[PDB]
Design an enzyme around this catalytic site. Structure first.
Site, PDB file in Angstrom:
ATOM      1  N   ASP A 196       0.798  -1.354  -0.275  1.00 55.15           N
ATOM      2  CA  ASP A 196      -0.067  -0.065   0.301  1.00 55.15           C
ATOM      3  C   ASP A 196       0.728   1.015   0.178  1.00 55.15           C
ATOM      4  OD1 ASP A 196      -2.284   1.276   0.338  1.00 55.15           O
ATOM      5  OD2 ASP A 196      -0.882   1.948   2.219  1.00 55.15           O
TER       6      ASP A 196
ATOM      7  N   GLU B 124       1.730  -0.823  -4.886  1.00 50.34           N
ATOM      8  CA  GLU B 124       0.253   0.227  -5.629  1.00 50.34           C
ATOM      9  C   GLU B 124       1.490   1.348  -5.969  1.00 50.34           C
ATOM     10  OE1 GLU B 124      -1.688   2.414  -2.370  1.00 50.34           O
ATOM     11  OE2 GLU B 124      -3.366   3.290  -4.336  1.00 50.34           O
TER      12      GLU B 124
HETATM   13  O1  LIG Z   1      -6.685  11.812  -4.647  1.00 48.92           O
HETATM   14  C1  LIG Z   1      -5.559  12.159  -5.745  1.00 48.92           C
HETATM   15  C2  LIG Z   1      -3.797  12.360  -5.863  1.00 48.92           C
HETATM   16  O2  LIG Z   1      -3.522  11.675  -4.446  1.00 48.92           O
HETATM   17  C3  LIG Z   1      -3.281  10.593  -4.593  1.00 48.92           C
HETATM   18  O3  LIG Z   1      -2.961   9.603  -3.682  1.00 48.92           O
HETATM   19  C4  LIG Z   1      -3.439   8.780  -3.564  1.00 48.92           C
HETATM   20  C5  LIG Z   1      -1.763   7.953  -3.329  1.00 48.92           C
HETATM   21  O4  LIG Z   1      -0.958   8.904  -3.413  1.00 48.92           O
HETATM   22  C6  LIG Z   1      -2.442   6.281  -2.899  1.00 48.92           C
HETATM   23  O5  LIG Z   1      -1.275   5.855  -2.013  1.00 48.92           O
HETATM   24  C7  LIG Z   1      -3.847   6.284  -2.863  1.00 48.92           C
HETATM   25  O6  LIG Z   1      -3.547   4.548  -1.999  1.00 48.92           O
HETATM   26  O7  LIG Z   1      -4.383   6.791  -1.792  1.00 48.92           O
HETATM   27  C8  LIG Z   1      -3.778   9.213  -1.927  1.00 48.92           C
HETATM   28  C9  LIG Z   1      -5.088   9.399  -2.318  1.00 48.92           C
HETATM   29  O8  LIG Z   1      -5.302  10.262  -1.475  1.00 48.92           O
HETATM   30  C10 LIG Z   1      -2.592   9.984  -6.163  1.00 48.92           C
HETATM   31  O9  LIG Z   1      -1.150   9.737  -5.350  1.00 48.92           O
HETATM   32  C11 LIG Z   1      -1.823  11.667  -6.845  1.00 48.92           C
HETATM   33  O10 LIG Z   1      -1.277  11.207  -7.844  1.00 48.92           O
HETATM   34  C12 LIG Z   1      -3.320  12.353  -7.236  1.00 48.92           C
HETATM   35  O11 LIG Z   1      -3.161  13.812  -7.903  1.00 48.92           O
HETATM   36 CL   LIG Z   2      -3.813  -1.115  -5.455  1.00 44.59          CL
END
Ligand SMILES: OC[C@H]1O[C@H](O[C@H]2[C@H](O)[C@@H](O)[C@@H](O)O[C@@H]2CO)[C@H](O)[C@@H](O)[C@@H]1O
Ligand SMILES: [Cl-]
Ligand SMILES: OC[C@H]1O[C@H](O[C@H]2[C@H](O)[C@@H](O)[C@@H](O)O[C@@H]2CO)[C@H](O)[C@@H](O)[C@@H]1O
Ligand SMILES: OC[C@H]1O[C@H](O[C@H]2[C@H](O)[C@@H](O)[C@@H](O)O[C@@H]2CO)[C@H](O)[C@@H](O)[C@@H]1O
Ligand SMILES: OC[C@H]1O[C@H](O[C@H]2[C@H](O)[C@@H](O)[C@@H](O)O[C@@H]2CO)[C@H](O)[C@@H](O)[C@@H]1O
Ligand SMILES: OC[C@H]1O[C@@H](O)[C@H](O)[C@@H](O)[C@@H]1O
Ligand SMILES: [Ca+2]
EC number: 3.2.1.1
Length: 496
Positions: free
Chosen positions: A197, A233
Site C-alpha cells: 500500500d 501500489e
Molecule cells: O487523490 C488523488 C491524488 O492523490 C493520490 O494519492 C493517493 C495515494 O498516492 C495512493 O497511495 C492512494 O492509495 O491514496 C491517495 C489518495 O489520497 C495520488 O498519488 C495522486 O497522483 C493524485 O493526484
Molecule cells: Cl491497488
C-alpha cells in the site's frame, strides 16, 4: 519478487475486499480452486483504528494501530486457518501490507482499535508494536503543515504525512525490522506475496531494505528459494517526478493507466474506440507487461478515491464492466486482478458520492457473512463479481490461453473488434450502435464451441450460444448492439 507463485495454469488474483477470513477459506475450497483462480488479495490483516465517525468506514483499515492479526475480518487463528485451507487447494493469499504509516495524527488516543490495543497518535505512542515518537518522520518532513502539500516535490511525498497519516521513519533499521517481523509472520503462515500500500509514499530503497529482511516462502507449499510476489501500489498517470519504474527493483507495480484508459475506450469517451486497442499494452504508453499488475477498478477508484477518475468502470456499470474485464482477461498484457465488491448506498450530492466511506455490509459494525444464493450469486449485499458467469469464465479463458500470442486481430475501424490467443481462444466484441455480423478467422481447430459469456459447457452440450468453427478456422458471429452482453468468447476447453 516478480513471480506470482500461483499454481501453474492459474493466472489471476481476486480482491475479496473486506471479506472475513472464514468466508475466504470456504470460498477457496468451494469456488476459487475448482474455477481456477490463482489467489486472493485480502484486506489488511493487522489491527487498525476503529473509526466511529463516520461509522466504521472501509478506510479505517488503512490506519494501523499494531501488527496483531486482529481485524473485522477475523483473528490470527482464523487468518492462519484461511491461509492453510487456501494453499491446500492451490489458491494463494496476498496481503495488503500497510507499512508507510500508522493512523491519522488527529485520531483520539485510547483503545478504539480492532484488538483493543492502546495507542496515542498525538504522542506518537503505539506500544503494541512498539513505536514511539522516534519512529516517525515528523523531524524529517519540511513542509509547514507536516503533511504532503505538493506532488511535484518527490521528497515531501515520501517524508511527509499523507492526509495526516503518521509517517513511519522507514529509513531507520528499527522500523524496517518491526515491519519485516510482521511480514515474516505472514510469510511463515503461508502468504504468497504482498500488495504494498502507498508505495509512492516510500523511498524505493527503504522498501528494498524491508524486503531484504524477508524469509523465503513456506517450504511445505512452495519450492525452496521462492520469494514473495510483490506488487506495489504506485499511482502514476504521468506528469510527476515519481514514476512507476522507480519501483521495478522491488517487484511488479500497479498500472493505473490501464483501467483509466480502458474505461474511457469502453465508454466511447474522448473520441476513443475499440479499434484503437489493436496495440494495447506498451503501445499505449504503459509500463512493461512483465511488471504491470492490471485491473479495471480497485477498491479506491471504484468509489472515487485514490486517483479516482470518471472513466473508471465498476459493477454499477455492469454491462460495460463485464466487457472491460473480459477484454483485460483475454489480452496478454500484464498480470490480472479481478475486483470483488460490496454494495453501498451510493448517493451523489453535487458531483460526489457522500457515502463513498461506507464500510462492508454489517450489523452494528460486525461484518456480515457472505451468503451464497442458489444461483451461485451472493447475498448480504456482497456483489461477488468474481462469481458472475461472464467474469468467472473469462478467468478460465486466461488460464486456457496462457502463453499464447495475440493474433488474428480484426476491427471495423470503429468498435467491432476480435482477436485470438494462438490456437487456444478467440473473443469478439461489439461496442458499436449496430449489429456485428461477420465470418472471422478464429485460429481455432474445427468444431462446436460453447460461448463462455452467455453460458457454460456441461455434459457434452452448451447452456448458451454455440459457435461453429469450420475446417479453415472461420466461424460466424452475430452480436446485436442490444445484447445484454455484447461479446462472445470461445476456447479450447469450451469445445464439445
Ligand atoms: O487523490 C488523488 C491524488 O492523490 C493520490 O494519492 C493517493 C495515494 O498516492 C495512493 O497511495 C492512494 O492509495 O491514496 C491517495 C489518495 O489520497 C495520488 O498519488 C495522486 O497522483 C493524485 O493526484
Ligand atoms: Cl491497488
Ligand atoms: O455530516 C458531516 C460530518 O458531521 C460529523 O463531523 C463533525 C464531528 O462530529 C465534529 O466532532 C467535528 O469534528 O466536526 C465534524 C464535521 O466537520 C460526523 O462525525 C461526520 O462523520 C460527518 O462526515
Ligand atoms: O484521519 C486521517 C484521514 O483518514 C481518511 O483518509 C483515508 C482516505 O479517505 C482513503 O482514500 C484511504 O487512503 O485511507 C485514508 C486513511 O484512512 C479521511 O478520509 C481523511 O480525510 C483523514 O484526514
Ligand atoms: O496508439 C496508442 C493510442 O491509440 C489511439 O491513438 C491513435 C492511434 O495510435 C492511431 O492508430 C490512430 O489511428 O487513432 C488514434 C487517434 O485517433 C488512442 O486514441 C490513444 O489514446 C492511444 O494512446
Ligand atoms: O534509499 C532510501 C533513502 O532514500 C533517501 O534519499 C531518504 O532521504 C532516506 O531517508 C532513505 O532511507
Ligand atoms: Ca512516507
Amino acid at each position: 519478487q516478480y513471480s506470482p507463485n500461483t499454481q501453474q495454469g492459474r493466472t489471476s488474483i481476486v480482491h475479496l475486499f473486506e471479506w472475513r477470513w472464514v468466508d475466504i477459506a470456504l470460498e477457496c475450497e468451494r469456488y476459487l480452486a475448482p474455477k481456477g483462480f490463482g489467489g486472493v488479495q485480502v484486506s489488511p490483516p493487522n489491527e487498525n483504528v476503529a473509526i466511529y465517525n463516520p461509522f466504521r468506514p472501509w478506510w479505517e483499515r488503512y490506519q494501523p494501530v499494531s501488527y496483531k492479526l486482529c481485524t473485522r475480518s477475523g483473528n490470527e487463528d482464523e487468518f492462519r486457518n484461511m491461509v492453510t485451507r487456501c494453499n491446500n487447494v492451490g489458491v494463494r493469499i496476498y496481503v495488503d501490507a500497510v507499512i508507510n504509516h500508522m493512523c491519522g495524527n488527529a485520531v483520539s488516543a485510547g483503545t478504539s482499535s480492532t484488538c483493543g490495543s492502546y495507542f496515542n497518535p498525538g504522542s506518537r505512542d503505539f506500544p503494541a508494536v512498539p513505536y514511539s515518537g522516534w519512529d516517525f518522520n515528523d523531524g524529517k518532513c519540511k513542509t509547514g503543515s507536516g503533511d504532503i502539500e505538493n506532488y511535484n516535490d518527490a521528497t515531501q511525498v515520501r517524508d511527509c504525512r499523507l492526509t495526516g497519516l503518521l509517517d513511519l521513519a522507514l529509513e531507520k533499521d528499527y522500523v524496517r525490522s518491526k515491519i519485516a517481523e510482521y511480514m515474516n509472520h505472514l510469510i511463515d503462515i503461508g502468504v504468497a506475496g504482498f500488495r504494498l500500500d502507498a508505495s509512492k509514499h516510500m523511498w524505493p530503497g527503504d522498501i528494498k531494505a524491508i524486503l531484504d529482511k524477508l524469509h523465503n516462502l513456506n517450504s511445505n507449499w512452495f519450492p525452496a528459494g521462492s520469494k514473495p510476489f510483490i506488487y506495489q501500489e504506485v499511482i502514476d498517470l504521468g506528469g510527476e517526478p515519481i514514476k512507476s519504474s522507480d519501483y521495478f527493483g522491488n517487484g511488479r507495480v500497479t498500472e493505473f493507466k490501464y483501467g483509466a484508459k480502458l474505461g474511457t475506450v469502453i465508454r466511447k469517451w474522448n473520441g476513443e474506440k475499440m479499434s484503437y486497442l489493436k496495440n494495447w499494452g506498451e503501445g499505449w504508453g504503459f509500463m512493461p507487461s512483465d511488471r504491470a499488475l492490471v485491473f479495471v477498478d480497485n477498491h479506491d477508484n471504484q468509489r472515487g478515491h485514490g486517483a479516482g477518475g470518471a472513466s473508471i468502470l465498476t459493477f454499477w456499470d455492469a454491462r460495460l464492466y463485464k466487457m472491460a474485464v473480459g477484454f483485460m482477461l483475454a489480452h496478454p498484457y500484464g498480470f490480472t486482478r479481478v475486483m470483488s465488491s460490496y454494495r453501498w448506498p451510493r448517493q451523489f450530492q453535487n458531483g460526489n458520492d457522500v457515502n463513498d466511506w461506507v464500510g462492508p455490509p454489517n450489523n452494528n459494525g460486525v461484518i456480515k457473512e457472505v451468503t451464497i444464493n442458489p444461483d451461485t450469486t451472493c447475498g448480504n449485499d456482497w456483489v461477488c463479481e468474481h462469481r458472475w458467469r461472464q467474469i468467472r469464465n473469462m478467468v478460465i479463458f486466461r488460464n486456457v490461453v496462457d502463453g499464447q500470442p495475440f493474433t488474428n486481430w480484426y476491427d471495423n475501424g470503429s468498435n467491432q473488434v476480435a482477436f485470438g490467443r494462438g490456437n487456444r481462444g478467440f473473443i469478439v466484441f461489439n461496442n458499436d450502435d449496430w449489429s456485428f455480423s461477420l465470418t472471422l478467422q478464429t485460429g481455432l481447430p474445427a468444431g462446436t464451441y460453447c460461448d463462455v459469456i452467455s453460458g457454460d459447457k456441461i455434459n457434452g452440450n452448451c447452456t448458451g450460444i454455440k459457435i461453429y468453427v469450420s475446417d479453415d478456422g472461420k466461424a460466424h458471429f452475430s452480436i446485436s448492439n442490444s445484447a445484454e452482453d455484447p461479446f462472445i468468447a470461445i476456447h479450447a476447453e469450451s469445445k464439445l
